[PDB]
Amino acid sequence: VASMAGVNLSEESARILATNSETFLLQAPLQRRILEIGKKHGITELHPDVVSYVSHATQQRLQNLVEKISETAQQKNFSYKDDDRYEQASDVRAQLKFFEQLDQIEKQRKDEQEREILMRAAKSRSRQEDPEQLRLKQKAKEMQQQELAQMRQRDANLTALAAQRITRVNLRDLIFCLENERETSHSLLLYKAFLK
C-alpha cells in the first residue's frame, strides 16, 4: 500500500486469476493469550481494538498462505495428456512398467533354476534317498499347473452363465510454500515438517 507499483500487489492479483483458471480468531481465548506474553514485558493491559486487530492480522497471514498453497495444489492437477498441443518427451514411468514385467520374468526364471537344482540333487534312473525332491515336488508342479486351469475356467464358466476435479492439499504443498518465502525458510517449523 506504501508502494503504488508494488510487486506483491501484482502477485496475488495474478495468483487469484490463476486459481480462478484452475480466520477470525476467537476473542475470549486470544485476549488471555496476549496478556500472558505481556507479563514478560510489563504490558499489563491491552487496548480493546488490538485483540480484533491481531485476529485480522492472523487472517491475512493464513489467507496469504492458503491462497499460496492452493495455486501449487492445482499445479499438479493439470493433465497435459488430454491436450494435444503438448507432446511427450521423456517417460521414466513406462520404462518402470517394462522393469516390472522384466522382474516377473526374472522371478519365473529363478523358480525354473530352483526346480532344475532340485532335480539334479538326486539324478538317477530311480528316485534317490532324501534328495529325490524331483519325485514329490515335480508332481506338485503338475498340481500347480492344474490349479492355473482353474484361474482360466472360472473366467469361462461365468461367461457361459452370462451368455469437477477435487483438489487435495498435501504437506508437500505447504512445505513448498515455506522454503520460498523469507520468513519460515530457515525455521524450526519447516525443519520439523520435513519429518512429519
Binding site: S3, M4, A5, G6, V7, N8, R85, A89
Partner: protein, 90 residues
Amino acid sequence: TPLVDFLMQLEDYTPTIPDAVTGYYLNRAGFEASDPRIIRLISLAAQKFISDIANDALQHCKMKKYTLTMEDLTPALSEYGINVKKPHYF
C-alpha cells in the same frame, strides 16, 4: 491460449539477450535447455523487467533525458519496493 501462441511464435525470434548467456544462468540454477523457445521467453521477461525500470527512471530524469544516475534509479525502484544503495565506500 495467447501465451502458448506466443511461445510457439518464439521459434525464429532472436531476443536481445543471447541464449548462450540466458541458458548459462539457467543452467547455474538447475534449469536445463530442453526447449530454446522457453529460454527465449525467460530472456524476454528479464528484458521487460529491466526495460520497465529504465523507462520509469527516464520519466524521473525528464521531470528533474540523457544520463542515468543513481538518484534516478532511487525513486524508480521505490515504487517497486526496492531500496537501492549508493556505493559510498569507494
